[PDB]
């Protein structure tokens, strides 16, 4: 059902998706009872278009856990990597 998937997104020039959630992020459109970070929109031309989909829950980025992370911390981390972000996501498959 749920699986942990690894994808690597190349910045071009950013990752090309949006996130909602996080501790203090006011929730997410998918699992309201989950504090986690969720992919919310994916740019169709962008570097994440073949890799991520709305609803994916990011649990790790370049080795950093996204479990029990604040919205702003999650955003800043993703933005501060210059070139590539290896993500572990949880997806309903």
């Amino acid at each position: 059902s749920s699986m942990e998937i690894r994808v690597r997104v190349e910045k071009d020039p950013e990752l090309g998706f949006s996130i909602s959630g996080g501790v203090g992020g006011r929730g997410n459109p998918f699992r309201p009872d989950d504090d986690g970070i969720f992919v919310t929109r994916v740019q169709p031309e962008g570097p994440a278009s073949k890799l991520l989909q709305p609803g994916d829950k990011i649990i790790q980025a370049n080795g950093y856990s996204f479990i029990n992370i604040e919205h702003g911390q999650a955003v800043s981390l993703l933005k501060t990597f210059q070139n590539t972000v290896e993500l572990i996501i949880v997806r309903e498959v």
Binding site: E14, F17, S18, I19, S20, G27, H71, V75, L78
Partner: peptide, 6 residues
């Protein structure tokens, strides 16, 4: 914010 682009 609710939704933030990265």
């Amino acid at each position: 914010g609710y939704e933030t682009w990265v």
